[PDB]
Amino acid sequence: QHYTVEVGDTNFTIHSRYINLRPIGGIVCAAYDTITQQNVAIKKLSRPFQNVTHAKRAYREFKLMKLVNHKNIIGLLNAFTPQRNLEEFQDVYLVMELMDANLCQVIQMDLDHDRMSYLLYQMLCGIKHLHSAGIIHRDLKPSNIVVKADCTLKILDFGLARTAGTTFMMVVTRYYRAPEVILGMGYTENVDIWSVGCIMGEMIRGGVLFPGTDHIDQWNKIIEQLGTPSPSFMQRLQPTVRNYVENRPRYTGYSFDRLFPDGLFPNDQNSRRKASDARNLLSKMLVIDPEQRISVDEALKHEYINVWYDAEEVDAPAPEPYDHSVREHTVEQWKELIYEEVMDY
Ligand SMILES: Nc1ncnc2c1ncn2[C@@H]1O[C@H](COP(=O)(O)OP(=O)(O)NP(=O)(O)O)[C@@H](O)[C@H]1O
Ligand SMILES: [Mg+2]
Ligand SMILES: [Mg+2]
């Protein structure tokens, strides 16, 4: 059986097993599962078959959640639809273990070095595992990462489809996206290292590094802090964006000592060395030209991170690679695939 309750602006129809629904993060609520006796998170996906773009995103994220297996990526406990057949099928519900906070809420707590380094180590182990499956994320952000009260971190999502294109000139948080993504260049796996450096820098300051109303505002924030990039970089750009990037003000960049001064880190010797190690890592991750930015593996071996290094976490490959396979189908056909996939669960 199932029943219906309203949580804020949204209605949830779920299985009777799930009780005490309350709002969190709204299409996600917290609940108690009576059968397994644990707190859970329930996310409602309203008509995921509604168009080719929503349908492709829902179906891919459903496949990836079951393909991947790592302690730093959220796992599915259950998935169901309370509708009784295909004709009536409308909504899918995903059920997850309930973590204690999102990474925004954790950053707002003003983290020390032990916690910042451990959370970064786990984010990089997660990314490494995703890359081992052929998934390059491109859209990592703190609101889509959650943390347990013991500091275990889990990435909630899988990012942009390989086809998904981005353009400089044309509702979503974009502040953690790499230069190559926002300028519409090609990308490699280290696109995700830029995002991790943006989060690391925000863990230290508490505020967004490169905020901005649009890609143009965000590019200006990037060059004001880090400096104007090289002519070789600019020459890879498409003509419209190239002309814009070439005719901006010429900035030198601030030294990382000025971008992340000692006075914005946790304390004030032991403190000063930990800040110095963090700056060195930022100087390698927040690098505009991806040809000179470090890799995931080099970041995991870095002095700021490697205090947690454990070969069994780090060398933990995906059981299979994802075949970016997810297909031109009608609305009606997308409905059937998603429905049978949910049933199969
Ligand atoms: N498993 C979970 N444990 C604890 N909190 C969670 C969990 N899943 C989601 N949340 C919380 O709910 C918020 C919204 O979740 P999320 O899956 O990001 O939905 P969304 O932002 O509505 N859709 P998307 O565009 O897919 O990110 C998160 O930022 C968390 O605060
Ligand atoms: Mg979200
Ligand atoms: Mg999502």
Numbering used by the authors: 7 to 31, 36 to 180, 184 to 281, 284 to 341, 344 to 362
From the paper:
In this study, we have solved the crystal structure of unphosphorylated DJNK in complex with adenylyl imidodiphosphate (AMP-PNP) and magnesium at 1.79 Å resolution. This is the first insect JNK structure to be solved and, together with the mammalian JNK structures, provides crucial insights into the evolutionary conservation of structures and catalytic regulation across insect and mammalian JNK proteins. The overall DJNK structure is composed of two distinct domains. The N-terminal domain (residues 7–109 and residues 338–362) consists of seven β strands (β1L0, β2L0, β1, β2, β3, β4, and β5) and two α helices (αC and αL16), while the C-terminal domain (residues 110–172 and residues 187–337) contains mostly α helices (αD, αE, αF, αG, αH, αI, αL12, α1L14, α2L14, α3L14 and αIL16,) with five short 310-helices and three β strands (βL5, β7, and β8). In the structure of DJNK complexed with AMP-PNP, the AMP-PNP is bound in a deep cleft between the N- and C-terminal domains. The glycine-rich sequence (Gly31-Ser–Gly-Ala-Gln-Gly-Ile-Val38) of DJNK, however, is not well defined, implicating that this loop is highly flexible and does not directly interact with AMP-PNP. The orientation of AMP-PNP in DJNK is determined by the hydrogen bonds between the phosphate groups of AMP-PNP and the backbone amide of Met109 and backbone carbonyl groups of Glu107 and Ser153. The side chain of Lys53, a putative catalytic residue which is highly conserved within the MAP kinase family, is directly involved in the formation of hydrogen bonds with the α- and β-phosphoryl groups of the nucleotide, thereby playing a key role in the proper positioning of ATP in MAP kinases. Two fixed magnesium ions are observed in the DJNK. No electron density, however, is visible for residues Thr181-Tyr183, including the two phosphorylation sites in the activation loop of DJNK, implying its high flexibility in the unphosphorylated form.
